[PDB]
Amino acid sequence: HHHHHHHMSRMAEQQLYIHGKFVAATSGKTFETINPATGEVLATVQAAGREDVDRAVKSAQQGQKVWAAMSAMARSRILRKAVDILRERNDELARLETLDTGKPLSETAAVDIVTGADVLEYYAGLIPALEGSQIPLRDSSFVYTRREPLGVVAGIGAWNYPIQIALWKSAPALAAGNAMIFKPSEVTPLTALKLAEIYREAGLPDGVFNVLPGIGAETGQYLTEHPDIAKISFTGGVASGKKVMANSAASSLKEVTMELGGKSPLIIAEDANLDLAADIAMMANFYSSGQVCTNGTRVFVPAKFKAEFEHKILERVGRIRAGDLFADDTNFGPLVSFPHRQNVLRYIESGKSEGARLLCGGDVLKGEGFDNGAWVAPTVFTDCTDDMTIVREEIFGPVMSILSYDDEAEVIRRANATEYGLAAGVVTPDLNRAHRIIHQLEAGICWINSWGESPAEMPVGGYKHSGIGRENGVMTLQSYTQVKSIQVEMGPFQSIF
Amino acid sequence: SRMAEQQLYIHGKFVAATSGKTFETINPATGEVLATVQAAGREDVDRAVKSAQQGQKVWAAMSAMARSRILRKAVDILRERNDELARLETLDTGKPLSETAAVDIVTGADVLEYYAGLIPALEGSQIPLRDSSFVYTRREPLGVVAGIGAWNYPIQIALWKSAPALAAGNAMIFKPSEVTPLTALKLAEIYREAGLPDGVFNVLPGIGAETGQYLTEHPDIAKISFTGGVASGKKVMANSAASSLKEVTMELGGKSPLIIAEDANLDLAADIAMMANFYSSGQVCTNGTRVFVPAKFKAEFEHKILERVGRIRAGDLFADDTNFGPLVSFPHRQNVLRYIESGKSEGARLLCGGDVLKGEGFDNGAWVAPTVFTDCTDDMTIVREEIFGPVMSILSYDDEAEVIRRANATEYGLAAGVVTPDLNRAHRIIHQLEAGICWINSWGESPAEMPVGGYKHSGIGRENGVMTLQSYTQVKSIQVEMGPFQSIF
Ligand SMILES: NC(=O)c1ccc[n+]([C@@H]2O[C@H](COP(=O)([O-])OP(=O)(O)OC[C@H]3O[C@@H](n4cnc5c(N)ncnc54)[C@H](O)[C@@H]3O)[C@@H](O)[C@H]2O)c1
Numbered sequence: 003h004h005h006h007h008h009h010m011s012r013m014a015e016q017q018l019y020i021h022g023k024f025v026a027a028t029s030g031k032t033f034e035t036i037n038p039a040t041g042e043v044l045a046t047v048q049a050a051g052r053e054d055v056d057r058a059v060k061s062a063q064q065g066q067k068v069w070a071a072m073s074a075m076a077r078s079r080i081l082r083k084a085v086d087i088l089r090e091r092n093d094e095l096a097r098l099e100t101l102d103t104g105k106p107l108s109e110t111a112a113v114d115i116v117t118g119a120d121v122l123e124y125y126a127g128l129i130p131a132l133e134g135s136q137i138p139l140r141d142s143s144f145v146y147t148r149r150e151p152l153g154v155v156a157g158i159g160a161w162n163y164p165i166q167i168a169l170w171k172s173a174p175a176l177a178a179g180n181a182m183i184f185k186p187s188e189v190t191p192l193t194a195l196k197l198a199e200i201y202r203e204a205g206l207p208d209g210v211f212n213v214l215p216g217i218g219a220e221t222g223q224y225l226t227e228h229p230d231i232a233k234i235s236f237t238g239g240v241a242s243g244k245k246v247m248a249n250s251a252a253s254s255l256k257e258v259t260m261e262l263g264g265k266s267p268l269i270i271a272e273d274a275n276l277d278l279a280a281d282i283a284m285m286a287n288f289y290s291s292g293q294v295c296t297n298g299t300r301v302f303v304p305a306k307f308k309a310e311f312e313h314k315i316l317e318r319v320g321r322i323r324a325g326d327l328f329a330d331d332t333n334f335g336p337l338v339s340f341p342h343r344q345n346v347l348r349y350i351e352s353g354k355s356e357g358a359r360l361l362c363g364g365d366v367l368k369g370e371g372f373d374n375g376a377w378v379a380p381t382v383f384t385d386c387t388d389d390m391t392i393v394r395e396e397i398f399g400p401v402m403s404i405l406s407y408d409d410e411a412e413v414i415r416r417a418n419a420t421e422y423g424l425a426a427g428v429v430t431p432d433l434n435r436a437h438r439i440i441h442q443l444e445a446g447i448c449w450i451n452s453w454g455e456s457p458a459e460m461p462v463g464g465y466k467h468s469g470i471g472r473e474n475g476v477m478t479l480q481s482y483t484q485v486k487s488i489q490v491e492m493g494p495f496q497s498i499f
Numbered sequence: 500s501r502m503a504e505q506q507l508y509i510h511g512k513f514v515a516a517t518s519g520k521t522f523e524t525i526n527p528a529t530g531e532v533l534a535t536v537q538a539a540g541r542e543d544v545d546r547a548v549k550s551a552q553q554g555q556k557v558w559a560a561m562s563a564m565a566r567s568r569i570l571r572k573a574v575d576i577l578r579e580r581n582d583e584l585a586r587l588e589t590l591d592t593g594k595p596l597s598e599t600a601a602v603d604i605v606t607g608a609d610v611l612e613y614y615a616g617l618i619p620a621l622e623g624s625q626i627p628l629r630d631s632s633f634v635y636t637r638r639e640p641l642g643v644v645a646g647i648g649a650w651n652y653p654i655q656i657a658l659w660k661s662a663p664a665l666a667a668g669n670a671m672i673f674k675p676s677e678v679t680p681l682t683a684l685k686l687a688e689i690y691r692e693a694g695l696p697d698g699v700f701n702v703l704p705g706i707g708a709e710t711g712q713y714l715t716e717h718p719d720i721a722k723i724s725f726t727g728g729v730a731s732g733k734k735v736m737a738n739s740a741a742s743s744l745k746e747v748t749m750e751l752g753g754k755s756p757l758i759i760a761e762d763a764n765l766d767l768a769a770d771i772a773m774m775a776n777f778y779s780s781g782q783v784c785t786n787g788t789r790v791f792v793p794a795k796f797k798a799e800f801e802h803k804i805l806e807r808v809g810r811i812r813a814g815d816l817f818a819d820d821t822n823f824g825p826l827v828s829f830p831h832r833q834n835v836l837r838y839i840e841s842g843k844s845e846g847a848r849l850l851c852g853g854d855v856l857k858g859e860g861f862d863n864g865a866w867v868a869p870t871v872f873t874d875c876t877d878d879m880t881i882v883r884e885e886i887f888g889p890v891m892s893i894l895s896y897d898d899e900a901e902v903i904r905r906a907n908a909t910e911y912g913l914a915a916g917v918v919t920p921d922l923n924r925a926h927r928i929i930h931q932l933e934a935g936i937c938w939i940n941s942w943g944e945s946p947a948e949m950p951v952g953g954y955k956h957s958g959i960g961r962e963n964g965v966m967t968l969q970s971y972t973q974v975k976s977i978q979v980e981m982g983p984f985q986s987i988f
């Protein structure tokens with residue numbers, strides 16, 4: 003059964019969002035966002051120029067002062083109103099996210115906005131608990147501290163969880179009393195513009211959340227260079243993260259936090275149930291079509307279990323349902339873009355070339371309704387070794403690498419023998435093995451007998467080359483403030499002169 | 500006589516460098532060479548990092564209280580050797596013994612003692628999600644970190660950087676200023692005598708653009724803590740950004756305002772301004788070098804400043820009564836003198852000083868007289884730029900809103916202060932100032948408990964306080980899932 007008559011016309015040209023309204027860019031620059039399931043253009047999108055960025059900062063400086071002068075509970079109520087709107091519009095926002103990203107609606111309608119709103123809801127309730135300290139020195143003197151807003155901060159987003167990233171960056175920044183200028187990925191700009199409208203409808207003062215689509219090397223760099231931005235929070239690849247660090251270091255002194263992906267290990271212990279292990283390995287590799295920074299893409303399996311484990315993976319890969327992204331039963335989508343597919347395919351070819359055994363997948367999906375999409379089959383390599391390119395490098399597609407191991411000390415060494423350090427996990431029913439292995443792994447995000455859950459309360463970020471700083475949890479609210487120490491000297495000051 | 504040629508400190512002992520590079524540290528009171536000092540080369544730095552990697556593992560495997568006791572032993576030694584260390588600091592820096600013997604080691608050891616006691620309180624958290632799952636976090640050491648020190652408070656900076664780093668379970672490689680490398684080497688020996696494991700505190704003298712750069716570029720250093728000027732701080736930020744991903748914290752000086760309120764007692768205000776400008780001969784990063792005085796009080800305030808400047812006692816740096824020294828080096832004196840000449844050339848009125856000290860016993864040292872400019876305006880070079888010498892700029896003002904604006908009209912933001920007996924004025928002014936370190940009716944006290952660092956271009960991050968101990972750990976989040984994991988595939 004063929005499915006045609008599905009032309010979707012273009013959206014309106016997308017503008018910038020500055021100071022509570024859409025405004026035309028003055029860059030002379032536009033770019034297109036493409037539906038990765040069909041190749042059709044979703045919208046032409048305007049890119050913010052240097053003067054547009056400067057106006058956005060001045061808008062943010064003005065809005066931040068209004069926002070910071072409110073009470074803590076007034077701020078809490080406005081962010082909760084935005085949460086309420088996000089819950090009401092979940093399905094509509096999820097459909098837009100599916101169009102822009104290629105992720106199944108079964109994901110976007112249950113995870114992306116749900117968990118993005120979860121984090122905003124969490125920080126909204128913590129605003130009144132944000133406190134300084136008081137330190138007695140002696141009867142005649144004491145110190146108190148204030149946690150003051152930084153001012154105007156910049157968030158730079160990635161294309162795999164667009165609205166979730168926008169919410170996870172903006173929520174602590176705004177709750178700490180800052181304004182944020184958010185630069186979405188040029189691959190997926192659309193839901194960030196919706197979020198800005200929602201924030202306005204909730205009562206957020208004009209300028210406190212401005213959204214600037216544009217190209218990383220242009221708009222993004224204009225932001226990192228601006229002298230009045232106090233902090234940058236970046237999600238994306240290592241290459242662009244290094245440009246952001248370098249450009250920010252060359253400009254006004256600012257703090258930079260970063261989440262840069264990884265090559266996270268999944269350690270299947272010698273006492274693990276292999277159905278559970280296989281279920282975890284599937285969720286650690288093929289959710290959002292393998293486009294998750296925390297994926298467990300090095301799956302370490304005991305040699306004695308490798309043959310059986312491979313069969314359990316093949317059985318579950320055979321259940322994956324690629325298809326209509328709006329269909330209830332679809333759980334696998336195209337990649338986010340055709341250029342990204344080309345890169346993933348180059349990684350797959352290196353796996354073949356370097357002698358890994360192809361267990362399944364390894365090609366594009368074919369036939370009517372896949373031929374127009376950026377699809378890559380769910381792919382598993384086995385007989386992998388630690389020197390292979392597919393094992394060493396983040397692929398960001400549906401490519402699992404199975405590595406066999408002999409003993410626990412060995413697998414810990416190998417799990418840690420990476421420049422990366424984002425996530426890790428272990429499958430074992432044993433109390434001592436679970437905690438003792440996890441305590442030795444050099445990663446910031448660790449799952450035991452699970453994968454992927456990221457509660458609002460739980461700080462997440464990378465060790466080593468996978469990141470600086472954390473997101474979520476109480477600590478991240480604090481990191482969007484700066485400490486002022488104040489000493490009150492009530493005794494007579496003694497000069498030596 | 501000259502000291503013995505100074506070597507690197509790596510893995511619990513002094514070791515000859517392999518750079519082919521030496522430099523001289525000069526006694527700024529005499530111009531004489533104190534010592535020839537070896538500089539660490541690129542291969543020396545790599546050996547220091549491997550030593551620190553080995554030592555950090557021993558250190559971090561000890562119990563918390565075992566680490567506390569060793570740092571407390573070092574405190575005990577520092578208290579006992581206070582005067583000897585102070586005398587060496589005075590030779591290397593030119594600061595009077597009346598300062599070094601009362602402040603530098605005393606407050607450096609205060610911060611080490613503070614953090615030693617806090618190690619056992621460093622905790623993670625636990626977060627219940629539901630009956631079948633919970634999260635817990637660990638605060639883990641970073642590994643090997645680097646501190647890069649400045650020349651005005653050499654051993655105090657070495658202790659304020661190493662104390663939280665070591666207390667959190669890290670090893671630190673410390674790079675002292677090439678102007679003042681001597682007390683950091685003494686500190687390294689003291690830590691070993693206290694029982695610090697070999698490699699946990701290594702000291703690499705050398706030139707900033709060589710040794711300093713090799714450290715900031717090394718792939719296995721997890722964090723850089725830097726104190727110094729803006730220009731060198733920018734180089735450190737850029738070189739670190741081009742190298743391994745690492746966090747960098749920085750304290751970079753300021754042009755801090757002291758606001759004298761219209762209801763202030765002017766004797767108190769003059770006393771605070773003197774202490775905010777002429778301690779350590781003006782070589783303190785938090786100095787209140789823009790002194791804002793109500794127009795109605797300016798004449799009387801100047802008389803009171805002149806009276807107290809007239810009392811300053813420059814002389815024998817080991818005499819009890821001396822309270823003013825030469826500057827740290829002859830190159831630094833030249834730069835301060837250029838600032839003084841610009842204040843003259845731009846039309847500021849010289850109230851006092853403005854020249855070198857002269858005569859027997861001053862002619863051979865890097866002395867600049869305590870200097871005060873008045874009739875200053877906000878566009879003047881001496882008002883806009885950090886001098887790091889004994890140069891006060893007096894600026895008159897008319898109203899409270901104006902002085903708040905002008906106080907904040909700087910790229911800097913390290914410290915600030917206000918002098919006022921009024922409750923509302925004191926707190927309301929301070930809450931509006933864009934600075935990290937704020938003093939009411941005082942200046943310069945920096946308790947171990949109090950976090951200190953800069954706003955805006957004066958810094959990133961904080962030192963001292965509970966938060967700095969936490970800042971030398973990294974958070975690992977661990978989810979324990981006890982229910983049956985659900986896969987959608
Ligand atoms: N969650 C993550 O950590 C994550 C997300 C997406 C991609 N990645 C990785 O990054 C790789 C490359 O992806 P990509 O090139 O499509 O994304 P990218 O990493 O270049 O994009 C991330 C963001 O950075 C911006 N950016 C890029 N260059 C910039 C610059 N010079 N200054 C400022 N901002 C700049 C982009 O516009 C976008 O907003 C992917 O293949 C994947 O491995 C990681």
Ligand SMILES: NC(=O)c1ccc[n+]([C@@H]2O[C@H](COP(=O)([O-])OP(=O)(O)OC[C@H]3O[C@@H](n4cnc5c(N)ncnc54)[C@H](O)[C@@H]3O)[C@@H](O)[C@H]2O)c1
Binds near residue numbers: 651676706729732
């Ligand atoms: N407490 C402070 O913030 C402080 C201290 C001293 C000087 N200063 C300011 O800085 C000005 C310049 O002083 P300076 O040049 O004699 O000191 P600096 O700021 O250059 O030196 C500080 C430290 O930085 C190191 N350093 C320099 N270049 C480096 C590099 N490329 N990589 C790594 N480390 C490097 C130096 O070796 C030294 O250890 C002074 O006039 C004063 O205004 C501020």
Ligand SMILES: [Ca+2]
Binds near residue numbers: 037038102103189190
């Ligand atoms: Ca798109």
Ligand SMILES: [Ca+2]
Binds near residue numbers: 527591679
């Ligand atoms: Ca010297």
